[PDB]
Design a protein around this ligand. Structure first.
Ligand SMILES: N[C@@H](C[C@]1(C(=O)O)C[C@H]2OCCC[C@H]2O1)C(=O)O
Length: 255
């Protein structure tokens, strides 16, 4: 009857600080898609838990020494029983940790101002006037860093160049950069949808350049590993995941 440690990260509208004049403590301090998800899992599988924000505020990437950081690291060193956040399922990650069936699908795309002639990653990679980058130490950064596709290698050379600092610490910083300067942020599509519907001067440029999903993470060889995936299929089957997405993404839109 262990009380599980859940590693996660701040990211709208997956995990956010609950607004209240009543100083909150514990898991009550947070709310969002992922917390509703963790709550469902908690009830479907009957387990206790304590939400812990990843110390370094990173999603997780492997440096030069093959050393991991972020939530991925927290799982590897068994400092967390599971990770419940917008954690991207990737091949390189599956080498060191486990992922449940996906609870949400998405893909890398481009967030930029509207009304410009830019229409694709190619239009971005061929030029240098418009600055562009991604969140440091995330699956999108490594996608470009390790790509063998000519276009993306050229983009990585630009966003990682010494001439400048094209990468951003987190999504907020990236978004602010797009709104105040001539910058395009390569970001995952479900967040681009969220951001553009709340910033009508912004838009997605082109379509998704890859296709993947978010899954619950657990240390390889975890006893919960199978139950988690079962509960996910149940939530998906019952239309529950769809309801949760709609609940947190609902808004006035752009007209
Ligand atoms: N899902 C990524 C993190 C991130 C990315 O590297 O694209 C950063 C953050 O960017 C905004 C959308 C949610 C997050 O995606 C990951 O699991 O590493």
């Amino acid at each position: 009857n262990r009380t599980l440690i859940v590693t996660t990260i701040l990211e709208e509208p997956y995990v956010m600080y609950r607004k209240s004049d009543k100083p909150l403590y514990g898991n009550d301090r947070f709310e969002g898609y992922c917390l509703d998800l963790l709550k469902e899992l908690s009830n479907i599988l009957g387990f206790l838990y304590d939400v812990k924000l990843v110390p370094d505020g990173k999603y997780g990437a492997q440096n030069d020494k093959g050393e991991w950081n972020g939530m991925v690291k927290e799982l590897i060193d068994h400092r967390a029983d599971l990770a419940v956040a917008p954690l991207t399922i990737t091949y390189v990650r599956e080498k060191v940790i486990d992922f449940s069936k996906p609870f949400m699908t998405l893909g890398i795309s481009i967030l930029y101002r509207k009304g410009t002639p830019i229409d694709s990653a190619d239009d971005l990679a061929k030029q240098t006037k418009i600055e562009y980058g991604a969140v440091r130490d995330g699956s999108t950064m490594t996608f470009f860093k390790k790509s063998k596709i000519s276009t993306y290698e050229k983009m990585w050379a630009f966003m990682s160049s010494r001439q400048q600092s094209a990468l951003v610490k987190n999504s907020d910083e990236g978004i602010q950069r797009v709104l105040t300067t001539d910058y395009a942020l390569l970001m995952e599509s479900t967040s681009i949808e969220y951001v553009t519907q709340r910033n009508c001067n912004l838009t997605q440029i082109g379509g998704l350049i890859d296709s993947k999903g978010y899954g619950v993470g657990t240390p390889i060889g975890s006893p919960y590993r199978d139950k988690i995936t079962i509960a996910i299929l149940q939530l998906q089957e019952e239309g529950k995941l769809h309801m949760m997405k709609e609940k947190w993404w609902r808004g006035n839109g752009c007209p």
